[PDB]
Structure 1
């Protein structure tokens, strides 16, 4: 039951199942995986595709001949399995040169190098068929207040993204960008810390239509925010270009638990929203099998990501299709929320005594919302305990 197929568009980063287990306090617990191995194992589990940072696929500093051979082997694995590559990204965070940032490093020479490294990988992403190019500015930020003038940093960040937009336009590429917010870690505070900040920034770019967000479940939860709500705002803005699915237990370091772990009810409401809205992008997992696990546990954890999505999809669909739930949604006036407040216009509203002088505030205040009954129907559907 709940068996994923490529139809479900489940994708995984090479760096997810390939995470060797090094953490702030501990050495690697697993050997490195050949990307070819990961492609073949993920395909066997029913994944649709993979994603990569440049330096996951091509060791940093590789010669041109080494680069070609790494890409050739990877493409053979994709061809052997039918796996796709819908998204790629740049590693602008691991190498020591990026310790103060890539696009917003205080050192101008580093900013220029970061752009050149990204541009090289955009070309590769396009060659592999990627539709989306993600940017996670994990080193953009500060540990201290004097170190980073945030207005100047935002100017540099806009300049960088504008140059990248000029680049893809000039080459006729169809790829679009997706900015991944995170509030902190590895920097004390990261620039563009939430979906909202990233959405706001995009509106100030020269070609805003080329940019959207890549929100990650656990990153919004690291600020204690409601991930489904943030996804709804991204959808409302037309900017949900990609998504990273995982789990997180609240305000901690980024745990990258398998999807469904962490906040299970938020996972339910997320799947309900994505499916109801008709989100058509990849269901991408940015997760880490815990370092306690051997390779059998790696593949079990990856399989669990997909299984949990599919269970939640079933339960959310049953919730929305249940005539008792539909009745409860009307009892709670969800239908009214979707109607305009004043399609009659401002003057009619100003002239409407029912909106002021003749509005019975105490009668309105007496009406219960019936939200608890609705939420218990939702709980019963999630748990398969209807009756």
Structure 2
């Protein structure tokens, strides 16, 4: 009763995840930097399908064109050697001091034009390496004080930057879509588009909305105390779950990026249940940081536990939905009735229906129990493997 990942499970990892050296706001690095080639080989041995990158994880900031080509060649050799793919890439618009007030929404116009040129150069690289999704996390777009950022003008600037990127990709004929990753705060006091709902709403004002979706991350929505599986259900309902970032978080505090399955384990169960029952077919990407207490052995153990925990939860949620006694409890709780139209008969028929109002017996309907606690204990027994 083992749970071994293969490339067919579509597990992916950022270079910056196993590569995090452990520098935190209060402490120096505890690990040496990893060569991207080494992380590719190590992850392929553990059963991953592919890796993702920011521009600056792969090519050191400020590299000449000659060093650039060399970093890319070595990387491409390691992907050829291992069969690893690169399904997603993104841009670092947060580390360099120039980005201290943002990239696409910095108050200085010159910085905003630089942020767009740095982005477009990386879209060409991403296409060259086969990525299908290009993520944008605007971690420096926001403010610590109320007068520093007029948010209407900042959303104008954010729409303008995403529209120009959509013009670029369509003009080049690339097959690449964008995914915005929300985060509510950190490193800015408040970050713009702080949740999946704010990012979905913003996309509907872009010139070509069909090019853009969301890349929600488990820990980010939980930094606002929100239910992550409910936000993913809304992104699926809108047709905008382009990619997802999996990790764990213990409640409302700094962004911990623990391995997937740590943090809120029942939310991890209900998230896997939803991804597998809606048939999400994108990458299962981990954006996590092995804690700085760990050496290299602890890094690969942490990355392997990400994939393990996903496959254990997958088996438990599939056993839950397959159990006849659960199917009976779902009917007892009227989940089948939730899926039927309230008024397929139409408005006039509803208005004329005396059984919907004038003769509706509210006390009898109120007295019906929902039987949700028995259903939730079945879900608990299935998660813990304690079926009796």
User: Which TM-score applies when normalising by structure 2?
Assistant: 1.00
Q: CA deviation at 1:33?
A: 0.2
Establish whether residue 323 from structure 1 lines up as the match of residue 324 from structure 2: yes
Q: CA deviation at 1:80?
A: 0.4
Distance in 2, matches of 1:266 and 1:24, equals: 28
Q: CA deviation at 1:286?
A: 0.1
Distance in 2, matches of 1:336 and 1:111, equals: 51
**What are the ranges of 5 or more consecutive residues in structure 1 without an aligned counterpart?**
none
Q: CA deviation at 1:345?
A: 0.2
SS of 1:84's equivalent? coil
Aligned length: 387
Distance in 2, matches of 1:83 and 1:358, equals: 64
1:56-108 C-alpha deviation (Å, 9 max, x unpaired): 00000000010000000000000000000000000000000000000000000
Q: CA deviation at 1:337?
A: 0.3
Distance in 2, matches of 1:205 and 1:174, equals: 18
Q: CA deviation at 1:145?
A: 0.1
- Residue aligning to 2:19: 18
Q: CA deviation at 1:181?
A: 0.1
1:198-254 C-alpha deviation (Å, 9 max, x unpaired): 000000000000000000000000000000000000000000000000000000000
1:155-204 C-alpha deviation (Å, 9 max, x unpaired): 00000000000000000001000000000000000000000000000000
1:41-60 C-alpha deviation (Å, 9 max, x unpaired): 00000000000000000000
SS of 2:148's equivalent? coil
1:126-170 C-alpha deviation (Å, 9 max, x unpaired): 000000000000000000000000000000000000000000000
1:261-318 C-alpha deviation (Å, 9 max, x unpaired): 0000000000000000000000000000000000000000000000000000000000
Distance in 1, matches of 2:264 and 2:274, equals: 16
SS of 2:86's equivalent? strand
Q: CA deviation at 1:25?
A: 0.1
SS of 1:307's equivalent? helix
Distance in 2, matches of 1:230 and 1:246, equals: 15
1:310-346 C-alpha deviation (Å, 9 max, x unpaired): 0000000000000000000000000000000000000
**What are the ranges of 5 or more consecutive residues in structure 2 without an aligned counterpart?**
none
User: Which TM-score applies when normalising by structure 1?
Assistant: 1.00
Q: What is the RMSD computed on CA atoms of the aligned residues?
A: 0.2
Q: CA deviation at 1:112?
A: 0.2
Q: CA deviation at 1:370?
A: 0.2
SS of 1:181's equivalent? coil
SS of 2:20's equivalent? coil
SS of 2:102's equivalent? coil
Within 5 Å, which residues of 2 pair with 1:191-270?
A: 191-270=192-271
Within 5 Å, which residues of 2 pair with 1:345-356?
A: 345-356=346-357
